[PDB]
Amino acid sequence: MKIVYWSGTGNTEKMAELIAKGIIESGKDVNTINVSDVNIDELLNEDILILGCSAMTDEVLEESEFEPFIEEISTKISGKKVALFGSYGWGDGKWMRDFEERMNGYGCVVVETPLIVQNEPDEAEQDCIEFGKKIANI
Numbered sequence: 001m002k003i004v005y006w007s008g009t010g011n012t013e014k015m016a017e018l019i020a021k022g023i024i025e026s027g028k029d030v031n032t033i034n035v036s037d038v039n040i041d042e043l044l045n046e047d048i049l050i051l052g053c054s055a056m057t058d059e060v061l062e063e064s065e066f067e068p069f070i071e072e073i074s075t076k077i078s079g080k081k082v083a084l085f086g087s088y089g090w091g092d093g094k095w096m097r098d099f100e101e102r103m104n105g106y107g108c109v110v111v112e113t114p115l116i117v118q119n120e121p122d123e124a125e126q127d128c129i130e131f132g133k134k135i136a137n138i
């Protein structure tokens with residue numbers, strides 16, 4: 001499996017690492033890839049796209065890297081299974097509600113409830129691991 005994410009301070013990166021840990025604990029392998037290093041062709045071959053990005057600007061996906069990435073894969077993911085996650089601060093998940101609607105609009109099948117964690121995981125570390133385990137069970 002593959003996890004692709006964007007993180008500005010490391011919070012979403014930490015989530016990605018924990019999600020990977022859950023998948024691995026379930027007995028499977030998974031590679032964690034920063035969005036700037038992603039290879040689209042290899043990504044689109046995946047059974048499940050695990051995508052993460054923190055809340056940016058005013059409740060939107062990060063604009064310089066993650067957003068263009070989503071726009072690029074948008075027309076070649078209809079029917080693809082996807083799982084979404086990200087860290088946020090002061091809001092209550094609007095950016096993620098929009099991210100989910102967006103992916104559904106591209107024809108994707110959102111396999112689990114998107115995982116959103118406030119700031120660094122900390123107490124929510126296990127929640128991140130469990131999300132990975134659910135994805136590994138699909």
Ligand SMILES: Cc1cc2nc3c(=O)[nH]c(=O)nc-3n(C[C@H](O)[C@H](O)[C@H](O)COP(=O)(O)O)c2cc1C
Nearest residue numbers: 007008009010011012054055057059088089090091
């Ligand atoms: C420029 C900027 C804008 C942000 N906009 C939002 C927002 O609209 N809603 C929210 O809840 N958090 C917002 N945040 C807070 C981040 O989502 C939060 O700090 C998160 O933990 C960062 O994760 P990261 O290290 O993976 O980037 C913003 C942070 C920055 C730097």
